[PDB]
């Protein structure tokens, strides 16, 4: 054709923290709850098929998969880790999901609770017409 | 920061 089309999608990964007051019964230190959401509470349903967390292998059931919004994971814990997030398009071609090893880190007792934020820019290149069409309306 | 796993 004369035309051509690039898509860019903007993703927030992030997470909290916070030392509890009490742990709990099995002496986890930390409530923590992690997400993936659109910038300024936009809808990324419309192309997100799925959230996948892979906790580290120490929690039960570690594969959490999320298929409507909000995308997270609220779990209680004593160790930060690495925590790979594969997010799922609703798309018949390349690529079917991104993957994202995001940081799940915790701060220590006497110092203020963790809140952050991780900016992911996603580009899709020429589209497939019906792909681009959930794209564009999120 | 914590220790990590």
Same mark, same amino acid.
């Given at each position: 054709m004369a035309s051509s089309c690039a898509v860019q999608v903007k993703? $927030? %990964?992030?997470?909290?923290?916070?030392?509890?007051?009490? =742990?709990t019964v099995e002496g986890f230190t930390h409530d923590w709850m992690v997400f993936v959401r659109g910038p300024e509470h936009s809808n990324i349903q419309h192309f997100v098929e799925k959230v996948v967390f892979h906790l580290h292998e120490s929690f039960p059931r570690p594969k959490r998969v999320c298929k409507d919004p909000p995308y997270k994971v609220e779990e209680s814990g004593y160790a930060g880790f690495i925590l790979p997030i594969e997010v799922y398009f609703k798309n018949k071609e390349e690529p079917r999901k991104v993957?994202? @090893?995001? @940081? +799940?880190? +915790?701060? %220590?007792?006497?110092? =203020? =609770?963790?809140?952050?934020?991780?900016? $992911?820019? +996603?580009?899709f290149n020429n589209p497939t017409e019906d792909f681009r069409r959930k794209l564009l309306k999120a | 920061q914590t220790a990590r796993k």
């Open positions: 993703l $927030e %990964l992030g997470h909290r923290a916070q030392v509890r007051k009490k =742990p993957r994202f @090893d995001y @940081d +799940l880190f +915790l701060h %220590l007792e006497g110092h =203020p =609770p963790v809140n952050h934020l991780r900016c $992911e820019k +996603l580009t | -």
